[PDB]
Ligand binder design. Structure first.
Ligand SMILES: *[C@@H]1O[C@H](CO)[C@@H](O[C@@H]2O[C@H](CO)[C@@H](O[C@@H]3O[C@H](CO[C@H]4O[C@H](CO)[C@@H](O)[C@H](O)[C@@H]4O)[C@@H](O)[C@H](O[C@H]4O[C@H](CO)[C@@H](O)[C@H](O)[C@@H]4O)[C@@H]3O)[C@H](O)[C@H]2NC(C)=O)[C@H](O)[C@H]1NC(C)=O
Ligand SMILES: *[C@@H]1O[C@H](CO)[C@@H](O[C@@H]2O[C@H](CO)[C@@H](O[C@@H]3O[C@H](CO[C@H]4O[C@H](CO)[C@@H](O)[C@H](O)[C@@H]4O)[C@@H](O)[C@H](O[C@H]4O[C@H](CO)[C@@H](O)[C@H](O)[C@@H]4O)[C@@H]3O)[C@H](O)[C@H]2NC(C)=O)[C@H](O)[C@H]1NC(C)=O
Ligand SMILES: *[C@@H]1O[C@H](CO)[C@@H](O[C@@H]2O[C@H](CO)[C@@H](O[C@@H]3O[C@H](CO)[C@@H](O)[C@H](O)[C@@H]3O)[C@H](O)[C@H]2NC(C)=O)[C@H](O)[C@H]1NC(C)=O
Ligand SMILES: *[C@@H]1O[C@H](CO)[C@@H](O[C@@H]2O[C@H](CO)[C@@H](O[C@@H]3O[C@H](CO)[C@@H](O)[C@H](O)[C@@H]3O)[C@H](O)[C@H]2NC(C)=O)[C@H](O)[C@H]1NC(C)=O
Lengths: 393, 390
């Protein structure tokens, strides 16, 4: 009881993003140890404790905050769109978990449209399923369907003419006059409701048969590309260009912070289909600036792509605990991983102390300085916390 | 009574033309005696006649008659030409002329259906195939009743046609659902005006809960290039419930600082769209659109680049220097950007890049015509001067 007394530490934290249908509801959980055992308190962004809301928000045993299923008219912003957090506290101090973003989605409007595409014979074609920005978080392309129905799904066989890219576009090798008679519909899936539906629009291709030579041209919006992909996932890099004769596509990666570039090596992991680079099992080193060089006899063109491979954020403090004599300095170092890293910030007993560096330093330790210390690592998506304790010697 | 050649009329940097229309480039130069005009390639070699394809007119213009698509020849129809003018006193070459013939090709405009949250502005775009993209643009938009929407200086209305050709729509309500919009494009080579068979539609949605401002990944970064004196627009494509506020800033170069954009007669803002007329080179820079509502935020980066036509001049236009005394040439030029400066003597590159060229001692060999050339990845310009002997 008195032996091995510790400040609190989180065993289990909720994930950064909690997104759920009003029909599904949600449950988040928080666990922490310590001696004495800490009390768990669900808090709001302003630091105040959240209470029960009938039929909407419920605090239960085992430190679980529950959001039951609810009618559309029952939607409440103060409940269903909010950032929560877990507060663990005992006599030695307080720690706050990473931000928990709770968003309930009441089932609503969405639909996909497919832009028609004029393509020169022999060139590759790309059909895109365009999804509204406000549903794009929960809605992505599952597959494609031709006029006969035949279902086209993503795969590792790149040898076929029809290929669904990791990003969801339908890629078609070496178009020909027959392809003009085919029409395609994209099937999208809502990850919250598990619902799937076909686009009302049918993607078409108009195949042009030029005699006179046409030089490579990239539409201005395709000239620069910015792609974000999760670590270990699969992804593709488009180079959108048409020419007669059909052009060649060469992919290079710039050496960071220089104008020099090296050709991208094709292997089991990295494949190239026409102008498209297809990469499975993303790695941290893939991140960087890429260049696609397009050439035919009459002219040439280029596409610049900035790739960012995101990795989950994690944080740790060295030491997890230390005992410092009065008057002597105390230093805390926040070790973190994940990509990208925007900020690093420090906290003491649930209060931001206004220090932005991985190293927190207390010049002269006093009574008031003892307690729990945290560092938070954040980016536009994820947050991660680490905790440590300062004791007086 | 005696003069070296100088160009009165030079061809433009770019000549684009349809195989149906053909094209004609003109070069005129003044000198005593009258200089002969010779057409050459980029490599400096003389161009010959190709029957039905490349010809010289009665007044000495290089002619590209209309031709069958099967008669397309790259050496003729994709080429960089130049005009060489000379007399007994020397030679001068005009700026590069990029000649590109374009065989008429089938094309059409499609319009993506736009889902819009009630109260938000909407932007409809006329999507054009890449191979006609340089030669085809939107001159207007037409609703279901045939009412023509033209770009205007009145920004207070419901509809606004932006310089880039998009149809901007203020504060979309569900009452706008029944309407349709078609773009009327213009082919500058063939002069053909045509109406899109596709009809742009707005689908209006009313969200149950609040919505954070959201920008599609491809709209997060934007890049705009515009010529001097020309009007343009900077889009911030974002939607939120309730409707958001749009704040435009401009970064101070080489810093994280930013200054808010100053709206005036020249610079006006419609919803989240920044619209500017009479572009100036100073407008060039990196901009930031910040979007806000009660429930969240979002941003859009835009790199703007304004270019100016290249022009060149040499001071003095002509000079006579005694044997042994130095001669000085200074190249005055304008336009943006300037990538390279190169000089020339009597049609031959002398390998000097500076705005100033000075001979320390004039010899009888130094007698002749001198030129300086300003260049970038698109445009080129020249200036000529004569040197005599005293
Ligand atoms: C979260 O919020 C969403 C959005 O408001 C709710 O979803 C709606 O729920 C209602 C009620 O269940 C759905 O109503 C539909 O009613 C059909 C007929 O029901 C009537 O049957 C007879 C007709 O006279 C009468 O007894 C009486 O009038 C009944 O009301 C059902 O057949 C529907 O079921 C099926 O069809 C729909 C598509 O129409 C499918 O999506 C369903 O999965 C099911 O296969 C349906 O129940 C309404 O359609 C829902 N809208 C949407 C967009 O899904 C959720 O209920 C709410 N979650 C909660 C409350 O937990
Ligand atoms: C209207 O909408 C705009 C756009 O969304 C909002 O502007 C954003 O505001 C947030 C918060 O104010 C900004 O995020 C913050 O940026 C600070 C500066 O970061 C710099 O330094 C780091 C290195 O540490 C670099 O990686 C980075 O590139 C910058 O150079 C951070 O220091 C902040 O972090 C600290 O504060 C937050 C709380 O805000 C803590 O959670 C963190 O742990 C840390 O202690 C913070 O990340 C964001 O950059 C702004 N966006 C833009 C585009 O400027 C407006 O806030 C909004 N208006 C209103 C009224 O809400
Ligand atoms: C295939 O296409 C690529 C891209 O269009 C061509 O590469 C580009 O070549 C141009 C020259 O034709 C380069 O511009 C030049 O740059 C120098 C400065 O380095 C400048 O002094 C010149 O006046 C000219 O503007 C351009 O940088 C280059 N870009 C890339 C990404 O390589 C390539 O030449 C084409 N292949 C063939 C065989 O032509
Ligand atoms: C320049 O090249 C273009 C493209 O090859 C030529 O356009 C083509 O012209 C032929 C007629 O010579 C068109 O065929 C005919 O069209 C009419 C309708 O206009 C139709 O009734 C006939 O049965 C026949 O199909 C062809 O469609 C057209 N193609 C395109 C893409 O426009 C043009 O003639 C060339 N110009 C010159 C001066 O050679």
């Amino acid at each position: 009881g008195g032996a091995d007394q510790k400040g609190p530490v989180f065993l289990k934290e909720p994930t950064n993003r909690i997104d759920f249908s009003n029909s599904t509801g949600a449950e988040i959980e928080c666990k922490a140890s310590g001696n004495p055992m800490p009390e768990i308190i669900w808090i709001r962004s302003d630091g105040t404790a959240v209470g029960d809301v009938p039929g909407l928000r419920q605090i239960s045993s085992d430190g679980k905050l529950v959001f039951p299923p609810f009618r559309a008219e029952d939607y409440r912003q103060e409940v269903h769109a909010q950032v929560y957090a877990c507060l663990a506290r005992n006599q030695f101090g307080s720690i706050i978990s990473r931000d928990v973003h709770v968003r309930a989605v009441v089932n609503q409007f969405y639909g996909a449209d497919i832009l028609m595409e004029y393509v020169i014979r022999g060139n590759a074609a790309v059909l895109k399923c365009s999804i509204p920005s406000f549903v794009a978080d929960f809605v992505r392309v599952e597959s494609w369907i031709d006029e006969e129905g035949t279902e086209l799904r993503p795969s590792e066989n790149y040898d076929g003419k029809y290929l669904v890219l990791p990003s969801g576009e339908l890629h078609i090798r070496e178009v020909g006059p027959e392809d003009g008679y085919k029409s395609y519909q994209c099937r999208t899936k809502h990850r919250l409701t598990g619902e799937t539906r076909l686009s009302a629009t049918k993607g078409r291709l108009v195949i042009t048969e030029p005699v006179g030579s046409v030089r490579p041209k990239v539409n201005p919006q395709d000239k620069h590309q910015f792609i974000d992909v999760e670590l270990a996932s699969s992804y593709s890099l488009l180079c959108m260009a048409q020419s007669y004769p059909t052009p060649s596509f060469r992919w290079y990666k710039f050496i960071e912070g220089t104008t020099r570039k090296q050709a991208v090596v094709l292997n089991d992991r990295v494949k190239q289909v026409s102008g498209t680079l297809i990469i499975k099992d993303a790695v941290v080193e893939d991140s960087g600036k890429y260049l696609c060089v397009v050439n035919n006899s009459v002219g040439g063109e280029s596409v610049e792509t900035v790739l960012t491979v995101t990795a989950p954020l994690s944080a740790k403090i060295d030491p997890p605990t230390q005992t410092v004599d009065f008057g002597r300095p105390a230093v805390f170092t926040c070790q973190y991983t994940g990509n990208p890293i925007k900020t690093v910030s420090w906290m003491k007993d649930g209060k931001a102390i206004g220090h932005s560096e991985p190293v927190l330093r207390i010049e002269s330790v006093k009574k008031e300085d003892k307690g729990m210390y945290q560092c938070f690592v954040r980016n536009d998506q994820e947050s991660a916390e680490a905790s440590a304790e300062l004791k007086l010697g």
